[PDB]
Amino acid sequence: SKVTTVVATPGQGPDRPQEVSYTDTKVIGNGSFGVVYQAKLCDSGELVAIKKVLQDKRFKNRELQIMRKLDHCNIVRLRYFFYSSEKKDEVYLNLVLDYVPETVYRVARHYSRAKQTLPVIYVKLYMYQLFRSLAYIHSFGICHRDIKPQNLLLDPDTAVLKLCDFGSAKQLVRGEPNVSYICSRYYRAPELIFGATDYTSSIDVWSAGCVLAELLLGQPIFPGDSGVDQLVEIIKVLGTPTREQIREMNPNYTFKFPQIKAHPWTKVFRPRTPPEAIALCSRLLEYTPTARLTPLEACAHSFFDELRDPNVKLPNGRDTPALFNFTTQELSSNPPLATILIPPHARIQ
């Protein structure tokens, strides 16, 4: 019906404005991230997402500066950005982004409501893609800081996963303090719960671990309306943290904790959970932040071996998405892991 034409800067490459026309605008949702629309680009007919937030007079928008640097198949691409005007006499930043039709949150909930779990092949695909996205953003020192099922977008037919919502993302520089109130209930690393301000990108990995555990269990692994309640659930699984583990999380807490013995992880999940899935969780969800796998090491984990098989297909018969086209940037934290990550068939001439 109605067509909106704006002049917008491309997300990447040279700043040469373009005339972007779109129609059929619908709200996807709104909240602390602003408003996210869906729209159809008039030329191509392609669906896109437009995230609109209020632009501060005093500062450049952080999320924009992050989004302009990122180019990866498992992160929603910033296509265009422009400024416009709900609150009158005020400016809004608009981000025109890839649109993806589903979220891991919605998918997980469909299966949970049906009293089933997602097939493992999809857990593998989705989590592998999440870890790639993290290996990449971390290679810039950028921490997402809000990894949770709703921020993981999924295409139901191609099995492509894209990380979205960089409104909490930040470059973490060693020795700089960062706020500890980021990251969503259920997915917060223990050092965040303990109020640490010197945390690293490893908080993203904890969160990714909670996502994995949740897709395997059918419900969140560390629920609780308070930090206290989340710690209790964490302690029931990991066991009581030692003093050395406490100091690694947050020095100013070296309170007394309930003395609980570790619950053997095989006991945590349903009987036929693949053991390599369980081993992977156990290496993500560690108290000591530096003891956790890096994202790139998680990608190289045996849980993901099936994805490296030359004859692996999606259940609907299609090919898997691209999983091995690693760039030097992506590999830069440990280049020899290429020897596992790029399987032999992916290196045929």
Binding site: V6, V7, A8, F82, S84
Partner: peptide, 8 residues
Amino acid sequence: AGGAAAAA
């Protein structure tokens, strides 16, 4: 970067 204009 921006500047808006609507049509139909």
